Write an enzyme that holds these catalytic residues in place. Structure first.
Site, PDB file in Angstrom:
ATOM      1  N   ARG A  80       0.861  -1.180   0.000  1.00 34.42           N
ATOM      2  CA  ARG A  80       0.000   0.000   0.000  1.00 34.42           C
ATOM      3  C   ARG A  80       0.877   1.202   0.000  1.00 34.42           C
ATOM      4  O   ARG A  80       1.695   1.392   0.908  1.00 34.42           O
ATOM      5  CB  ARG A  80      -0.947   0.030   1.206  1.00 34.42           C
ATOM      6  CG  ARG A  80      -1.745   1.327   1.377  1.00 34.42           C
ATOM      7  CD  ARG A  80      -2.941   1.114   2.387  1.00 34.42           C
ATOM      8  NE  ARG A  80      -3.707   2.334   2.632  1.00 34.42           N
ATOM      9  CZ  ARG A  80      -3.401   3.252   3.561  1.00 34.42           C
ATOM     10  NH1 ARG A  80      -2.346   3.089   4.369  1.00 34.42           N
ATOM     11  NH2 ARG A  80      -4.183   4.310   3.718  1.00 34.42           N
ATOM     12  N   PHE A  87       2.362  10.775   1.142  1.00 27.58           N
ATOM     13  CA  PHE A  87       1.930  10.344   2.450  1.00 27.58           C
ATOM     14  C   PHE A  87       2.986   9.352   3.012  1.00 27.58           C
ATOM     15  O   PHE A  87       3.778   9.683   3.887  1.00 27.58           O
ATOM     16  CB  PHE A  87       0.537   9.704   2.329  1.00 27.58           C
ATOM     17  CG  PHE A  87       0.014   9.099   3.613  1.00 27.58           C
ATOM     18  CD1 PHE A  87       0.496   9.509   4.858  1.00 27.58           C
ATOM     19  CD2 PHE A  87      -0.971   8.098   3.556  1.00 27.58           C
ATOM     20  CE1 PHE A  87       0.013   8.972   6.066  1.00 27.58           C
ATOM     21  CE2 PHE A  87      -1.487   7.530   4.767  1.00 27.58           C
ATOM     22  CZ  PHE A  87      -0.958   7.969   6.031  1.00 27.58           C
ATOM     23  N   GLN A 146       3.803   1.573   2.772  1.00 30.39           N
ATOM     24  CA  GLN A 146       3.464   0.613   3.811  1.00 30.39           C
ATOM     25  C   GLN A 146       3.791  -0.821   3.377  1.00 30.39           C
ATOM     26  O   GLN A 146       3.476  -1.204   2.264  1.00 30.39           O
ATOM     27  CB  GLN A 146       1.969   0.736   4.148  1.00 30.39           C
ATOM     28  CG  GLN A 146       1.479  -0.322   5.166  1.00 30.39           C
ATOM     29  CD  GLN A 146      -0.009  -0.197   5.448  1.00 30.39           C
ATOM     30  OE1 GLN A 146      -0.695   0.685   4.900  1.00 30.39           O
ATOM     31  NE2 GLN A 146      -0.505  -1.069   6.289  1.00 30.39           N
ATOM     32  N   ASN A 167      -1.228  -0.344  12.395  1.00 31.50           N
ATOM     33  CA  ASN A 167      -1.929  -1.179  13.369  1.00 31.50           C
ATOM     34  C   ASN A 167      -3.398  -1.285  12.994  1.00 31.50           C
ATOM     35  O   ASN A 167      -3.807  -0.787  11.934  1.00 31.50           O
ATOM     36  CB  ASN A 167      -1.745  -0.638  14.823  1.00 31.50           C
ATOM     37  CG  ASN A 167      -2.205   0.789  14.972  1.00 31.50           C
ATOM     38  OD1 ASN A 167      -3.335   1.134  14.583  1.00 31.50           O
ATOM     39  ND2 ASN A 167      -1.322   1.649  15.470  1.00 31.50           N
ATOM     40  N   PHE A 179       5.266   1.529   8.241  1.00 32.89           N
ATOM     41  CA  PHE A 179       5.345   2.413   7.126  1.00 32.89           C
ATOM     42  C   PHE A 179       6.576   3.292   7.260  1.00 32.89           C
ATOM     43  O   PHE A 179       7.121   3.422   8.350  1.00 32.89           O
ATOM     44  CB  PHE A 179       4.084   3.283   6.954  1.00 32.89           C
ATOM     45  CG  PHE A 179       3.666   4.082   8.174  1.00 32.89           C
ATOM     46  CD1 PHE A 179       3.764   5.488   8.179  1.00 32.89           C
ATOM     47  CD2 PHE A 179       3.089   3.432   9.312  1.00 32.89           C
ATOM     48  CE1 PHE A 179       3.356   6.235   9.309  1.00 32.89           C
ATOM     49  CE2 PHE A 179       2.639   4.175  10.426  1.00 32.89           C
ATOM     50  CZ  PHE A 179       2.766   5.601  10.433  1.00 32.89           C
ATOM     51  N   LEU A 230      -0.932  11.410  13.068  1.00 34.15           N
ATOM     52  CA  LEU A 230      -0.703  10.031  13.547  1.00 34.15           C
ATOM     53  C   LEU A 230      -0.016   9.951  14.907  1.00 34.15           C
ATOM     54  O   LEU A 230       0.085   8.865  15.474  1.00 34.15           O
ATOM     55  CB  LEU A 230       0.064   9.221  12.476  1.00 34.15           C
ATOM     56  CG  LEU A 230      -0.566   9.141  11.074  1.00 34.15           C
ATOM     57  CD1 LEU A 230       0.365   8.378  10.149  1.00 34.15           C
ATOM     58  CD2 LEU A 230      -1.940   8.450  11.107  1.00 34.15           C
ATOM     59  N   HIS A 280       0.459   5.757  16.409  1.00 26.74           N
ATOM     60  CA  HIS A 280       1.382   4.830  15.719  1.00 26.74           C
ATOM     61  C   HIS A 280       2.742   5.026  16.315  1.00 26.74           C
ATOM     62  O   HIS A 280       3.151   6.172  16.509  1.00 26.74           O
ATOM     63  CB  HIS A 280       1.372   5.121  14.223  1.00 26.74           C
ATOM     64  CG  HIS A 280       0.040   4.805  13.617  1.00 26.74           C
ATOM     65  ND1 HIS A 280      -0.258   3.558  13.107  1.00 26.74           N
ATOM     66  CD2 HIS A 280      -1.106   5.525  13.563  1.00 26.74           C
ATOM     67  CE1 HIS A 280      -1.525   3.540  12.723  1.00 26.74           C
ATOM     68  NE2 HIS A 280      -2.060   4.724  12.987  1.00 26.74           N
TER      69      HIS A 280
END
Lengths: 168, 11
Positions: A61, A66, A69, A107, A118, A127, A131
């Site tokens: 992903r 951004f 991942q 998660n 990531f 985040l 995370h």
């Protein structure tokens, strides 16, 4: 003091180079150790019946501007992964997502860390506190950028991005 | 939105 680990990356069938990463074991020792051991594969076979190792797994992903991942070496789509510990708690939120090229845990809510992670490509402060940030890229920033360009708004890579080797 | 989850990717 802090372990340094690497991924060798292919994009499509083409070796792209290597991402070299520092893990912040001094402040986040449980999270760093999980990632270090999943790079080497030293814990051997896991509870999922597959090697506890990033080698052969993909960045499944990828979202431009951004993050990238990966780490789902059991299902390859975001639904799997497993820690060397069998999920584990969010260790701490000492580090924040204040810079690109940080390593942080994916998660499925509070205290559900497994193997997915990531590498940020922008600051991701929304985040913070959700995370666990546990390392950074030391070298291979341009490789991360090359992976990032393989992303999409729906996260589906436009070309497969494989961790062909991993370790210390 | 811009999350990093494992299974149900949200907005």
């Amino acid at each position: 003091g802090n372990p340094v680990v690497y991924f060798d990356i292919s994009i499509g069938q083409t070796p792209a180079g290597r991402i070299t990463m520092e893990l912040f074991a001094d402040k986040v020792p449980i999270t760093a150790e999980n990632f270090r051991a999943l790079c080497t594969g030293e814990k051997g076979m896991g509870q999922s019946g597959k090697p506890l190792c990033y080698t052969g797994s993909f960045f499944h992903r990828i979202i431009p501007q951004f993050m990238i991942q990966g780490g789902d070496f059991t299902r390859g789509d975001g639904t799997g992964g497993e820690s060397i510990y069998g999920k584990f708690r969010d260790e701490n939120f000492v580090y924040t997502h204040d810079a690109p090229f940080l390593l942080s845990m994916a998660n499925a809510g509070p205290n559900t860390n497994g193997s997915q992670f990531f590498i940020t490509t922008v600051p991701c402060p929304w985040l913070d506190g959700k995370h666990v940030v546990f390392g950074k890229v030391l070298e291979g920033m341009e490789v991360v950028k090359s992976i990032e360009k393989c992303g999409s708004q729906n996260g589906k890579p436009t070309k497969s991005v494989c961790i062909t080797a991993s370790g210390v | 939105x811009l999350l990093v989850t494992a299974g149900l990717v949200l907005a």
